[PDB]
Amino acid sequence: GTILIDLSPDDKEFQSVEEEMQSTVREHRDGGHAGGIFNRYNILKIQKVCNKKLWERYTHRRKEVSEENHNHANERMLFHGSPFVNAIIHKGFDERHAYIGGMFGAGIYFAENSSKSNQYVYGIGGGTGCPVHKDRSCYICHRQLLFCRVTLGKSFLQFSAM
Amino acid sequence: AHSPPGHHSVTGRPSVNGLALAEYVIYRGEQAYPEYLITYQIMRPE
Numbered sequence: 001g002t003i004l005i006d007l008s009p010d011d012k013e014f015q016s017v018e019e020e021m022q023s024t025v026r027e028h029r030d031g032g033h034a035g036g037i038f039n040r041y042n043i044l045k046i047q048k049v050c051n052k053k054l055w056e057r058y059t060h061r062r063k064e065v066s067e068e069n070h071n072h073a074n075e076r077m078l079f080h081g082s083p084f085v086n087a088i089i090h091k092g093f094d095e096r097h098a099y100i101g102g103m104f105g106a107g108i109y110f111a112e113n114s115s116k117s118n119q120y121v122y123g124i125g126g127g128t129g130c131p132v133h134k135d136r137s138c139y140i141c142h143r144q145l146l147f148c149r150v151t152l153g154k155s156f157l158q159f160s161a162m
Numbered sequence: 163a164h165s166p167p168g169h170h171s172v173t174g175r176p177s178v179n180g181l182a183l184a185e186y187v188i189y190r191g192e193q194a195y196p197e198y199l200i201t202y203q204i205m206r207p208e
């Protein structure tokens with residue numbers, strides 16, 4: 001029951017989301033090994049993901065979390081790159097498919113830096129790169145990221161040496 | 163896995179790279195909604 005609605009580049013909502021993508025690119029200490037060498041994107045399409053049951057599932061949990069955290073859902077908009085983006089948009093996120101080997105425990109990972117999530121669009125560490133050219137720095141092939149509404153609630157602050 | 167006792171998520175905050183923004187972990191699929199699907203290319207630096 002997922003519907004994808006194309007946003008017009010003339011629309012302030014498109015421009016706003018593009019700006020979040022572009023403005024959160026950073027240099028990565030792998031020199032581009034995982035996600036490629038770039039300072040900016042060419043945004044080709046931005047689609048709103050509409051799914052009533054997944055949304056109600058999210059807002060139901062958001063309410064529980066809010067009530068457990070002095071009425072503060074601590075809701076953020078965060079990036080997520082994954083080979084399984086097409087499954088995520090139809091089936092939702094699924095903690096039975098958490099990232100087992102993530103630094104911060106087996107869970108579902110999100111990034112403020114769009115370019116961090118870009119490192120995972122082709123797999124862990126970029127996998128073997130784009131399917132057509134096997135190039136983690138492919139400038140030709142289209143990539144897809146999700147920009148997700150994420151409820152953090154009371155978030156455990158873990159400082160990492162990254 | 164489970165979130166820390168009494169917590170709903172983890173904030174992973176870089177303490178070495180000052181330009182690196184945070185990463186976040188949740189432990190229930192219901193705590194995220196995939197709101198926008200962004201199709202893009204990385205661009206070759208000029």
Ligand SMILES: C[C@@H]1CN(c2cc(F)c3c(c2)N(C)C(=O)C32CCN(c3nc4c(c(=O)[nH]3)CCCN4C)CC2)C[C@H](C)O1
Nearest residue numbers: 079080081082097098099109110111116117120123124185
């Ligand atoms: C059976 C296996 C499945 N397999 C595979 C590949 C894969 F790429 C993943 C998974 C699985 N699973 C469960 C995932 O979760 C991820 C996807 C998303 N992902 C992620 N991690 C991020 C950020 C982010 O946007 N996405 C930003 C913040 C920092 N961070 C760590 C983590 C890796 C392919 C392999 C050949 O066969």
Ligand SMILES: [Zn+2]
Nearest residue numbers: 130133138141
């Ligand atoms: Zn390619």
